[PDB]
Design a protein around this ligand. Structure first.
Ligand SMILES: Cc1c[nH]c2ncnc(NC[C@]3(O)CC[C@H](C)CC3)c12
Length: 167
């Protein structure tokens, strides 16, 4: 039993809610919140800018030190950093940017990172400025993640369509 509330059950391990991941993180303080990051951990907009703004830029400060030491992530890769005031940890996961020509097949690799964590609060990867079809992203998630994932979708009309489609 966990403290995630009001999520619609999609599969055995995937639950979904029309909500802001920031507000869900502040309320639940999960062990792991997933960030939809880029390889440089530059958290400007989307989920990344939203999470970072909620940390008063501490996420960005920590991220800049991470990159200075380790260099950029791989597309499809991830790193574990602090969750600051939002969660214990933040798993920064890089989905492919299909508006940049990056390989959509890398979306499955990106979701594989979730399997290293028993429970996660996450957004759909590669949506938004990265341009992937949300229904596709949701389907890859269901077919790849085996741990317990709670999805927060912050677009009402998109959420409504996602919960009326097949997976
Ligand atoms: C920006 C933001 C802030 N807080 C959030 N919580 C969840 N998702 C978010 N953006 C991605 C999406 O869920 C999926 C793609 C769609 C185009 C927009 C909604 C955000």
């Amino acid at each position: 039993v966990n403290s995630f509330s009001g999520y619609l059950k999609l599969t055995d391990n995937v639950y979904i809610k029309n909500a802001d991941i920031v507000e869900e993180a502040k309320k639940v303080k999960p062990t792991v919140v997933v960030n939809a990051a880029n390889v440089y951990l530059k958290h400007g907009g989307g989920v990344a800018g939203a999470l970072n703004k909620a940390t008063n830029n501490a996420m960005q400060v920590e991220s800049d030190d991470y990159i200075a030491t380790n260099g950029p992530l791989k597309v499809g890769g991830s790193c574990v950093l602090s969750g600051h005031n939002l969660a214990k940890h933040c798993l920064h996961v890089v989905g492919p940017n299909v508006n940049k020509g990056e390989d959509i097949q890398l979306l499955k690799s990106a979701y594989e990172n979730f399997n290293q964590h028993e429970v996660l609060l996450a957004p759909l990867l590669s949506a938004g400025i990265f341009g992937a079809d949300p229904i596709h992203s949701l389907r890859v998630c269901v077919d790849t993640v085996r741990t317990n994932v709670y999805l927060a979708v912050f677009d009402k009309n998109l959420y409504d369509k996602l919960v009326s489609s097949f997976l």
